[PDB]
Amino acid sequence: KKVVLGKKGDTVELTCTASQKKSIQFHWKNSNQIKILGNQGSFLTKGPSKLNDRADSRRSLWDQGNFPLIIKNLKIEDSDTYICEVEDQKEEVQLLVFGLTANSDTHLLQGQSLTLTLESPPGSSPSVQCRSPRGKNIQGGKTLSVSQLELQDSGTWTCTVLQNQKKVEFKIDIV
Amino acid sequence: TFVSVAPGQTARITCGEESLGSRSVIWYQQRPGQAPSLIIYNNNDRPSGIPDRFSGSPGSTFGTTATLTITSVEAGDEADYYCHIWDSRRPTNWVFGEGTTLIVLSQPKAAPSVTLFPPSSEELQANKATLVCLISDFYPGAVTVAWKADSSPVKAGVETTTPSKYAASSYLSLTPEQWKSHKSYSCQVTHEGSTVEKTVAP
């Protein structure tokens, strides 16, 4: 019963830890119980998943009794319950991946509107709190859009996306 | 080139350059009026419908030429034959090998009938001249035609059809002065080891 939030396009790590300090065999599987990763003694093995070109693990840690799964170049469709099967115990961790797309231009004109559509998994209920470069809180739901802007609102905008008591912040640049 | 064979005897048709490396000779046949069609590929493998009478030399010995052999030849094998050579030491060839026309000699000896005309008075009144030499009623379909101006062979202005099935024509373009200057002109037609000469004088 664990949740990890990931940002689209940035790497993430999931972690599986045993009570023994020995390198012992583990496997990582997705919610449909398809192999993503495993080890074979000290060798790394990848499994027939959509993550196959992008999954990895730090093998030095296996010899310490703990086993990550590392996913690079993360995409929204990588959101799933992921499990680890070590010591005849089943760790379950729910990865959710979020991202941000501005629908409005990279170069806005004077006195216009900003439109941001976040990317989220299907069957999810995201929550969002955005902020301006200076001192303006913005609240909203599925699509956040500020209908009125000023030329004082050029600069780096920060927006928090929140889910299951956890939060991440995204950064975008507006001129 | 041409190969001629009596029915039931073996024919051998050679095609292409001498081999340099290992090879895959492909062979094709073209019947008159028809598209080229495969006989053999991979030196001696035949598609469905080609009889085992056709066989090809393997891609074996270096410095030898490809040969198609056709045993027990019948009149329905009277066709053009082409090859396409793949060789491990040569590039892909994008032109086929030169075609060998197989003539099947069922019927012998029918000699031509030759007719030769002087130019028309209407053509001479047009300041032009053509001698017309017409050849018919012969078999097999192979003739060669040459002309003379008195006894000197004619090098320019001779035009000749391919015989088809089977008669032919040949023409000699002259000016009226070139026509009148010689005592006469000859049209010679050679067929199956003998030559007929027809003459016409101004």
Partner: protein, 226 residues
């Protein structure tokens, strides 16, 4: 049965783009290699290129800047375009289902393993002529009779383009003993032919050759006399 059928314009002018289509049935074009091949009159065939939907496509190096071969799976057909044409590009062009094969030996001869193609199913072909003339109609000269007890009597038809010319005699009331020889293409790029009848020498009937050339819309009756 796999069936292939080529089509095209028939006559092209120099420097224009020849374009041909090859409609295919009995197989789907994705599942096969295709070649375009052509054969000039009296010459051996020439391979233009081969194409496959995978992109396993290579052309004759002489034609590489001028030629394109393509496949259209939605219409289930093969196509050819050849830019910049000259009379050297006159040929009957053919479309062929091409089959790939390999010669494989021991690994001591890995340098000698090679791939090859052969053509398995062909279409009937499309004649392409490249020339530079809109039209030319004939002249007709008679060939008067002179000797033999039966004698040849005829007409010479000179300098027309394109083919054909039709000749009948006596409006078709004379067909036995009649021979119209095929046209000679002369070095000028124009055609000429002759037609003769073989008739007795005693002379009661009138003889007329009826020469017609539809491309120039020209029809000439020529009476022939001794």
């Amino acid at each position: 049965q796999v069936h292939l059928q080529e089509s095209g314009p028939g006559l092209v002018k120099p420097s224009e783009t020849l374009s041909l289509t090859c409609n295919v049935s009995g197989t789907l074009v994705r599942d096969n290699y295709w070649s375009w091949i052509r054969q000039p009159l009296g010459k051996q065939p020439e391979w233009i290129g081969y194409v496959h939907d995978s992109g396993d496509t290579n052309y004759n190096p002489s034609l590489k800047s001028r030629v394109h071969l393509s496949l259209d799976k939605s219409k289930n057909l093969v196509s050819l375009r050849l830019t910049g044409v000259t009379a050297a590009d006159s040929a009957i062009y053919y479309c062929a289902t091409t089959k790939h094969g390999r010669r494989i030996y021991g690994v001591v001869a890995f340098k000698e393993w090679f791939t090859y193609f052969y053509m398995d199913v062909w279409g009937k072909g499309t004649s392409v002529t490249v020339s530079s003339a809109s039209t030319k109609g004939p002249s007709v000269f008679p060939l008067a009779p002179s000797s033999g007890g039966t004698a040849a009597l005829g007409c010479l038809v000179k300098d027309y383009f394109p083919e054909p010319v039709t000749v009948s005699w006596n409006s078709g009331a004379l067909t036995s003993g009649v021979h119209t020889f095929p046209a000679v293409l002369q070095s000028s790029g124009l055609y000429s032919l002759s037609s003769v009848v073989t008739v007795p020498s005693s002379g009661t009937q009138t003889y007329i050759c009826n020469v017609n050339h539809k491309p120039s819309n020209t029809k000439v009756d020529k009476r022939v006399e001794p």
